[PDB]
Amino acid sequence: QAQRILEEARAYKAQTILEAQGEVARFAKLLPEYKAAPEITRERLYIETMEKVLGNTRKVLVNDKGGNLMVLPL
């Protein structure tokens, strides 16, 4: 009973720590690379991320200066 719920929570805590460590280690090794070439890394990541998001979400590509639209939700 007692031990049961004790170890149960303890696992979540351990998972967080382990997950945190991994993410930290990834951002660690990558930080010096960014400092070496900030502009090049920024452009690469920026385009890589942008192509992924726009790859799925629909787009209009309509010209500005006209303020009218119909969201048409459901």
Partner: protein, 105 residues
């Protein structure tokens, strides 16, 4: 018909007295189980807090080297996850910076 009625009434009465005792005992069980369930939930939060509280120091000291850079990496990830589903409509403009390389060189 009078004897039947009075006897039948007493019978139903005796049956009904037992029924309320049953419910009373039933409700008592509910209380105690909930107590234990809540008790367990309390111990879980305690440990579940230590987890994020311990990890918060790792995130802070690690990312405290370059906040702007960490904001870029993290913020980009968020977009990929937020717009993952095909349930959005990005009404961009042709003048948009990302479309800077769509105008005749």
């Amino acid at each position: 018909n009078r004897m039947r009625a009075e006897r039948e009434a007493v019978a139903r009465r005796h049956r009904s007295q037992g029924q309320e005792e049953a419910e009373k005992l039933r409700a008592t069980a509910d209380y105690e189980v909930t107590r234990t369930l809540a008790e367990a939930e309390r111990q879980g939060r305690i440990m579940r807090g230590e987890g994020d509280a311990e990890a918060a120091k790792l995130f802070a000291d690690a990312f405290s080297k370059d906040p702007d850079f960490y904001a870029f990496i993290r913020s980009l990830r968020a977009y990929e996850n937020s717009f993952s589903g095909n349930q959005d409509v990005m009404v961009m403009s042709p003048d948009s910076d990302f479309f800077r390389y769509m105008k005749t060189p």
